Every structure is written in C-alpha cells, then in structure tokens.
C-alpha cells in the first residue's frame, strides 16, 4: 500500500512503522530509490536516515506533520553517504536532534555531508553503548562490522518483526552488492551475518535499495560477499 506524497513514497510496514522512499535520477542511470524508516513511539516520532536531499527530507517532515502530527524527537542516520545523510540540514532546520556512528561524523566533512549533532559509540559485541543513545525508545542500534562502508550501522525496532540493514543488505534476488568503492571486501560477509545474528527474530528485513524482504536477504547478501574474500 504505497502512499505518494509529492515526489516521495511512504509504505506502512507495521502499526507504528513506515518506510520512506526518495529518488535520485542521474544521466546514464535509472532513478535510484533509497529507503529509510519512520517510527511512531507513543507521542513522538523517530526517523532513520534522511532522503537524498534537503528538499526531499523536508517533505518527509511534512508528511509526518500531516499524517502523524507529533514531534520528531530524533533521527539516526546509518552511514556518511548522500542517500543516508544528504538531508541533514533539513533535520537541523526543523530542530530535530541527530545521531550517527562516531565514524560517520568523522567521515561526514570529507564525504560532503553535514555531521549529525551527536556521536554513537559501540561496544565490542557491536551493540550501541546506551549512554550514547539517550531516548532511542524501541530503536536498537547495532554496528555489524565494516561492509558496504566502514561506518555502516543497522537498526532493529523493538515490538516489531523489523530490522533495518541500510545499504549493507541487498534483497534475496539482488544481482550485486551495489557500489563497493568504500566497501570492506574482506569483512563484508561476516558483517552481513553479524547483522542477522543480532536480530534473529526479525522476519521483515528492510534495506536501502530494495523493498522489504525475508531473511533470505541476509543469507543471499552474505553469500555474495563470500565471493569478495
Ligand atoms: O547509493 C548508491 N549505491 C549503493 N548503496 N548501497 N550500495 N550501493 C548509488 N550508487 C553509487 C554510485 C556511485 C558511488 C556510490 C554509490 C548512489 C549514491 C550516491 C549518489 C548517487 C548514486
Ligand atoms: Zn552508502
Ligand atoms: Zn546506498
């Protein structure tokens, strides 16, 4: 049930969860979809990832205002690339507190992104140190290890069957791992399986560049990454 709002698409995945989708169309390539998440947590909203641009991201906020009409308490962004952090200024202009992997905030200047206002750090088991993720509610943030990028993180939603792989995970029928220019080819496979292991009850796997899929997305992504070692 896709809901069109301006140039963006919103799809409800759970009573309190929506996928947001925005498009970037360059010459010599088809328009590229990028997906993030919107979560209503009681009387507030949480966002995972910006759209490609400030204008699109402001439209995400406008849709939230129209359909949910509750404050957006925070956003977490899942690595320092345009499809995940291209709209940071729109979030800050709206007064929304922003969070990213410390490494993402480190990379953001060079990558041409505005850094998030707060840095997450991670324990050795990969789970976010909770003292760096205040008031994340049902958002369970996990660093699976380097893969699509060295800084990519992932997000599960407590109370749902949903885990978000961002650009790390591709769908079960994908024909490649996408752009590998910033990838960690040696560690990608372990990182994909680490993501699955951290959210073992998740039956709906959401990702950046395909529609939601079964856990076969994890096994297939990892099996493709095995070929990079
Ligand atoms: O996001 C993407 N690819 C992806 N995501 N996850 N795995 N591959 C898109 N491809 C791409 C192209 C060149 C360099 C890096 C990525 C894209 C990103 C940014 C601007 C335009 C297009
Ligand atoms: Zn990326
Ligand atoms: Zn991507």
PDB file of N, CA and C and ligand atoms in Angstrom, residues 32-34 52 79 81-84 148 166-168 170 178-179 208-209, ligand 3:
ATOM      1  N   UNK A  32      17.222   6.067  -8.828  1.00  0.00           N
ATOM      2  CA  UNK A  32      17.645   5.170  -7.758  1.00  0.00           C
ATOM      3  C   UNK A  32      16.784   5.467  -6.540  1.00  0.00           C
ATOM      4  N   UNK A  33      16.087   4.446  -6.048  1.00  0.00           N
ATOM      5  CA  UNK A  33      15.322   4.555  -4.812  1.00  0.00           C
ATOM      6  C   UNK A  33      16.250   4.409  -3.617  1.00  0.00           C
ATOM      7  N   UNK A  34      15.988   5.198  -2.578  1.00  0.00           N
ATOM      8  CA  UNK A  34      16.608   4.981  -1.271  1.00  0.00           C
ATOM      9  C   UNK A  34      15.527   4.957  -0.200  1.00  0.00           C
ATOM     10  N   UNK A  52      17.701  11.814  -0.109  1.00  0.00           N
ATOM     11  CA  UNK A  52      18.912  12.210  -0.815  1.00  0.00           C
ATOM     12  C   UNK A  52      19.237  13.679  -0.610  1.00  0.00           C
ATOM     13  N   UNK A  79      24.975   5.804   7.634  1.00  0.00           N
ATOM     14  CA  UNK A  79      26.391   5.999   7.267  1.00  0.00           C
ATOM     15  C   UNK A  79      26.513   7.295   6.466  1.00  0.00           C
ATOM     16  N   UNK A  81      26.939   8.690   3.504  1.00  0.00           N
ATOM     17  CA  UNK A  81      26.738   8.763   2.064  1.00  0.00           C
ATOM     18  C   UNK A  81      25.477   9.581   1.790  1.00  0.00           C
ATOM     19  N   UNK A  82      25.344  10.068   0.541  1.00  0.00           N
ATOM     20  CA  UNK A  82      24.287  11.033   0.222  1.00  0.00           C
ATOM     21  C   UNK A  82      22.895  10.458   0.458  1.00  0.00           C
ATOM     22  N   UNK A  83      22.684   9.177   0.149  1.00  0.00           N
ATOM     23  CA  UNK A  83      21.336   8.634   0.303  1.00  0.00           C
ATOM     24  C   UNK A  83      20.915   8.508   1.762  1.00  0.00           C
ATOM     25  N   UNK A  84      21.854   8.554   2.704  1.00  0.00           N
ATOM     26  CA  UNK A  84      21.545   8.417   4.124  1.00  0.00           C
ATOM     27  C   UNK A  84      21.694   9.707   4.908  1.00  0.00           C
ATOM     28  N   UNK A 148      29.415  -2.528   3.505  1.00  0.00           N
ATOM     29  CA  UNK A 148      29.167  -1.542   2.459  1.00  0.00           C
ATOM     30  C   UNK A 148      30.038  -0.308   2.652  1.00  0.00           C
ATOM     31  N   UNK A 166      19.967  -1.045   6.047  1.00  0.00           N
ATOM     32  CA  UNK A 166      20.541   0.074   5.317  1.00  0.00           C
ATOM     33  C   UNK A 166      21.198  -0.403   4.042  1.00  0.00           C
ATOM     34  N   UNK A 167      22.341   0.183   3.713  1.00  0.00           N
ATOM     35  CA  UNK A 167      22.981  -0.226   2.472  1.00  0.00           C
ATOM     36  C   UNK A 167      23.812  -1.500   2.608  1.00  0.00           C
ATOM     37  N   UNK A 168      23.908  -2.078   3.807  1.00  0.00           N
ATOM     38  CA  UNK A 168      24.687  -3.304   3.975  1.00  0.00           C
ATOM     39  C   UNK A 168      24.012  -4.496   3.305  1.00  0.00           C
ATOM     40  N   UNK A 170      21.287  -6.438   0.737  1.00  0.00           N
ATOM     41  CA  UNK A 170      20.554  -6.407  -0.523  1.00  0.00           C
ATOM     42  C   UNK A 170      19.491  -7.495  -0.510  1.00  0.00           C
ATOM     43  N   UNK A 178      25.957  -3.616  -5.115  1.00  0.00           N
ATOM     44  CA  UNK A 178      25.918  -2.183  -5.334  1.00  0.00           C
ATOM     45  C   UNK A 178      27.313  -1.601  -5.468  1.00  0.00           C
ATOM     46  N   UNK A 179      27.467  -0.351  -5.036  1.00  0.00           N
ATOM     47  CA  UNK A 179      28.765   0.299  -5.137  1.00  0.00           C
ATOM     48  C   UNK A 179      29.678  -0.174  -4.018  1.00  0.00           C
ATOM     49  N   UNK A 208      18.154  -0.434   1.986  1.00  0.00           N
ATOM     50  CA  UNK A 208      18.197   0.898   1.391  1.00  0.00           C
ATOM     51  C   UNK A 208      17.626   0.913  -0.020  1.00  0.00           C
ATOM     52  N   UNK A 209      17.872  -0.135  -0.803  1.00  0.00           N
ATOM     53  CA  UNK A 209      17.640  -0.035  -2.241  1.00  0.00           C
ATOM     54  C   UNK A 209      16.784  -1.165  -2.803  1.00  0.00           C
TER      55      UNK A 209
HETATM   56 ZN1  LIG B   3      23.067   3.165  -0.709  1.00  0.00          ZN
END
